[PDB]
């Protein structure tokens, strides 16, 4: 994360880390949505222009971590995956539309004071909170600045930018299954996700029920914390119908 700070112990309990198995390197961030399901971004697993096509056997997942270095015994859990589910209509050849992925763990994870799942938004939740001006929260162990990796999980609070502002800030076709967030050049504040925070969660606290809802998935962006550039996030709700079918079919 860029212009973010250290997270509190168990501040993002649904926060997941996607690792390559050989060699063991941080790929993306992710999120726990139940006992057996993880939700990252598709480009993390599949990006053919960079010969990226990951099997379940290629990847590893680490849940409950605070310090990327320090391994804490019965706190953090390392799980392997049974199967991966990339969106059938995920457009990598043009704009990273429907940049969503689901990971079924080979064994369910027990919840604790550090491992706990996030809420997926509903009709009303998304319509009411997915509105420009409101601040959401990005989290990850990605680069601290552009081209620099952190020890403790980082956290930034970013406001949702008006769809016409997002559109005019980029050259790429922005679809309803995307939303953007970040501060404007004269807003006097900064922050963004960076290489490594991809697939990670953009959450929000419901003023209605004090529950943390995952509104987005850290998808793409042009650089990191560039003035006049905003972070683009996968519109979780717009794809909840797909998330449901994969969970209910397997």
């Amino acid at each position: 994360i860029v212009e973010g700070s250290d997270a509190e112990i168990g501040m993002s309990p649904w926060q997941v880390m996607l690792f390559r198995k050989s060699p063991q390197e941080l790929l993306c961030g992710a999120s726990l949505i139940s006992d057996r399901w993880v939700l990252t971004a598709a480009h993390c697993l599949l990006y053919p222009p960079w010969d990226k096509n990951f099997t379940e056997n290629d990847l590893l997942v680490r849940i409950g971590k605070h310090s990327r270095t320090r391994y804490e015994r019965n706190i953090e859990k390392i799980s392997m995956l049974e199967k991966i589910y990339i969106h059938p209509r995920y457009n990598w050849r043009e704009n990273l539309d429907r940049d969503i992925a689901l990971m079924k763990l080979k064994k369910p994870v027990a919840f604790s004071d550090y491992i706990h799942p996030v809420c997926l938004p509903d009709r009303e939740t998304a319509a009411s909170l997915l509105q420009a001006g409101y601040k959401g929260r990005v989290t990850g162990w990605g680069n601290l600045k552009e081209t620099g990796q952190p020890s403790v999980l980082q956290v930034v609070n970013l406001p949702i930018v008006e769809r016409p502002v997002c559109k005019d800030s980029t050259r790429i076709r922005i679809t309803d299954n995307m939303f953007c967030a970040g501060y404007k050049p004269d807003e006097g504040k900064r922050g963004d996700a960076c290489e490594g925070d991809s697939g990670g969660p953009f959450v929000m606290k419901s003023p209605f029920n004090n529950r943390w809802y995952q509104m987005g998935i850290v998808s793409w962006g042009e650089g990191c914390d560039r003035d006049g550039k905003y972070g683009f996030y996968t519109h979780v709700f717009r794809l909840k119908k797909w998330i449901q079918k994969v969970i209910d079919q397997f």
């Binding site: 004071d113 419901s206 529950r211 943390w212």
Partner: peptide, 27 residues
Amino acid sequence: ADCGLRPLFEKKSLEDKTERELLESYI
């Protein structure tokens, strides 16, 4: 089921150092 309720925060009835910023933005 009992999601989005942090065991060390919402369950223990505690606010994280910056969650007010979020709720404040809704005004």
